[PDB]
Amino acid sequence: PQITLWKRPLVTIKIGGQLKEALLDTGADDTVIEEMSLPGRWKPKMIGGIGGFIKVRQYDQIIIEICGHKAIGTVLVGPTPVNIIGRNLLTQIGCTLNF
Amino acid sequence: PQITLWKRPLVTIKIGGQLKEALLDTGADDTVIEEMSLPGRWKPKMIGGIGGFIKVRQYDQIIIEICGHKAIGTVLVGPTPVNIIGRNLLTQIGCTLNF
Ligand SMILES: CC(C)(C)[C@H]1Cc2cc(F)ccc2S(=O)(=O)N(C[C@@H](O)[C@H](Cc2ccccc2)NC(=O)O[C@H]2CCOC2)C1
Ligand SMILES: [Cl-]
Ligand SMILES: [Cl-]
Numbered sequence: 001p002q003i004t005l006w007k008r009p010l011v012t013i014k015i016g017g018q019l020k021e022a023l024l025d026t027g028a029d030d031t032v033i034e035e036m037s038l039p040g041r042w043k044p045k046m047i048g049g050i051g052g053f054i055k056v057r058q059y060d061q062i063i064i065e066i067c068g069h070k071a072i073g074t075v076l077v078g079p080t081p082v083n084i085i086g087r088n089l090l091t092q093i094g095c096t097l098n099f
Numbered sequence: 100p101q102i103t104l105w106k107r108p109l110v111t112i113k114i115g116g117q118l119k120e121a122l123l124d125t126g127a128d129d130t131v132i133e134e135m136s137l138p139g140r141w142k143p144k145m146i147g148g149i150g151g152f153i154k155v156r157q158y159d160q161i162i163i164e165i166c167g168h169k170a171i172g173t174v175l176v177g178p179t180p181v182n183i184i185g186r187n188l189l190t191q192i193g194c195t196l197n198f
Contacts, residue, residue: 003196005186009125024196025126026108049149087104095198097102097123
């Protein structure tokens with residue numbers, strides 16, 4: 001698809017069998033999702049945003065479907081205001097910026 | 100152009116006669132630039148992100164050149180860690196996400 005930016009680029013994602021709404025975010029290096037349970041072990045990570053650096057849980061090799069496209073990669077879980085799909089997964093679905 | 104997302108989508112912009120590096124950010128509703136002087140009146144605004152909120156100065160009807168494309172809109176000025184080109188100006192240069 002071709003997504004214009006007059007409104008937030010929100011899409012449906014599927015993770016752990018659940019449907020959620022997430023923002024396609026080219027300004028985010030990593031994918032960060034609101035609190036949920038994911039399988040396996042997690043590692044600590046700090047992510048810096050507009051208000052500073054914060055603590056999240058890093059889960060690797062997580063299966064996630066984004067707007068019908070299958071991706072498998074790192075998902076960070078923590079107190080984010082919105083679910084964010086970052087560049088680590090946008091590359092997997094072949095997403096580019098065009099003008 | 101077509102911009103891939105293996106690295107941060109950083110571009111050169113021209114604002115208030117100065118050249119600056121900025122991030123093309125689909126996850127940002129608004130454009131936020133590091134401390135600088137801009138002409139005209141401003142009003143205070145709070146903007147929220149990962150890590151909480153920052154206080155910025157809102158300048159309206161500001162011209163920016165982004166990749167050679169002229170655009171006009173609201174520019175927020177404040178203690179942002181990176182210069183961000185948000186949706187308000189990405190729409191003006193005809194920027195879309197494609198996959
Ligand atoms: C809340 C949301 C709607 C999404 C956004 C809120 C927002 C709204 C605006 F109008 C303007 C700016 C911002 S913002 O700037 O707050 N932001 C945009 C993100 O793309 C930031 C940009 C950025 C990049 C580097 C340093 C600071 C900021 N990335 C980010 O937090 O990456 C983190 C997140 C995961 O990867 C690293 C989050
Ligand atoms: Cl605007
Ligand atoms: Cl358009």
